[PDB]
Amino acid sequence: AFRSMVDLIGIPQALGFTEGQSPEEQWRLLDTLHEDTEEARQRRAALAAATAAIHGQANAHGVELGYRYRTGALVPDGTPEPADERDPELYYRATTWPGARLPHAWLENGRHRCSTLDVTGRGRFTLLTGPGGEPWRDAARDAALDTGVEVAVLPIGAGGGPRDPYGTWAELREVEESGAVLVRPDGHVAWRARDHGHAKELPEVMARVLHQP
């Protein structure tokens, strides 16, 4: 917010606006912005570069939506945090890396359209899985014994559960069909598992998430 406030003054500065200038001087500097000089060329560059910085407040998609919890009510899966060449303040990158906000995808339940965000949250832990994810059932029941906390198991694209009509969730989930993404009531990812292999880890995982003894 601070940096974005600083950036705003850049716009008038670019134009060469200063103190002790008359209306008539400033109307001139606007008029003489489109001149073919060393002066106006340098101004025009500075305006387009000062303009560019404003994206940091008008399209700060990565700050708005892309923050991730690196420590807290979650269990890292040992994978490195995804990252790319792009400025991480401007550009959001959907990931199920634990601590991130669960990626949005359009699912369909019967003929009802819902996001991955609508079928999770709402006061419960939810475990998203897919074909071959039956093992998660037992693991969830075991977890509710060990911990007292219920984990709703929601298979997407299998066993008559919600569908993934576009394939988007299969692209974004970054686990295998048989894996699992464990979603907290706040919509962030507590934990993830590549495949059903990891199913036995869940009771433990839920215990660490709740910081239970």
Partner 1 sequence: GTAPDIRVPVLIVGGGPAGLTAALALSRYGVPHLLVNRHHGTAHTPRAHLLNQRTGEIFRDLGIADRVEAHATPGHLMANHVFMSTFAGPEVARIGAYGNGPDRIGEYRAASPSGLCNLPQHLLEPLLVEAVQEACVGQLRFGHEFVSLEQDEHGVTSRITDRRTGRDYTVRSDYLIGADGARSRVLAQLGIALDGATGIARAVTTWFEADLSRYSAHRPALLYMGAVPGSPPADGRVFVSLRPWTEWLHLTFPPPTADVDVEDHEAVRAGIRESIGDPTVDVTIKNVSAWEVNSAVAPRYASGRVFCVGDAVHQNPPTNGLGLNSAVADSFNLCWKLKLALEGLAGPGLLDTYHDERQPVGRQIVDRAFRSMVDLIGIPQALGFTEGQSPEEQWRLLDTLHEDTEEARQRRAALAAATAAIHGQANAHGVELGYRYRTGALVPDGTPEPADERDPELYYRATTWPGARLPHAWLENGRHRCSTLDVTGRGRFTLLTGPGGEPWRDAARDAALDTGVEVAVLPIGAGGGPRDPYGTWAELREVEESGAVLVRPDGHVAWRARDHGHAKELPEVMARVLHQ
Residues that bind partner 1 (CB under 8 A): 11, 15, 24, 27-28, 30-31, 34, 36, 47-48, 51, 54-55, 57-59, 61, 65, 91-92, 94, 104, 106, 108, 111-113, 115, 117-118, 131-132, 157-159, 163, 165-167, 177-178
- Nearest-CA neighbor of 194 among 132, 112, 122? 132
Least Å distance between CB 45 and partner 1? Answer: 12
Of 109 and 207, which has the nearer Cβ to partner 1? 109
Of 30 and 124, which has the nearer Cβ to partner 1? 30
Give residue 179's identity as a one-letter amino acid code. G
- Nearest-CA neighbor of 76 among 66, 88, 68? 68
Least Å distance between CB 58 and partner 1? Answer: 4
**Using a CB cutoff of 8 Å and minimum separation of 24, what contacts does 21-26 make?**
none
Least Å distance between CB 212 and partner 1? Answer: 26
Least Å distance between CB 65 and partner 1? Answer: 6
Of 88 and 115, which has the nearer Cβ to partner 1? 115
Instruction: In whole angstroms, give the CA distance from residue 69 to residue 14.
Output: 38
Of 167 and 212, which has the nearer Cβ to partner 1? 167
CA 7, 12, 16: angle at the middle one, nearest 5?
125
Least Å distance between CB 109 and partner 1? Answer: 10
The two most distant CA atoms of the chain are separated, in Å, by 78
- Nearest-CA neighbor of 106 among 119, 94, 96, 97? 119
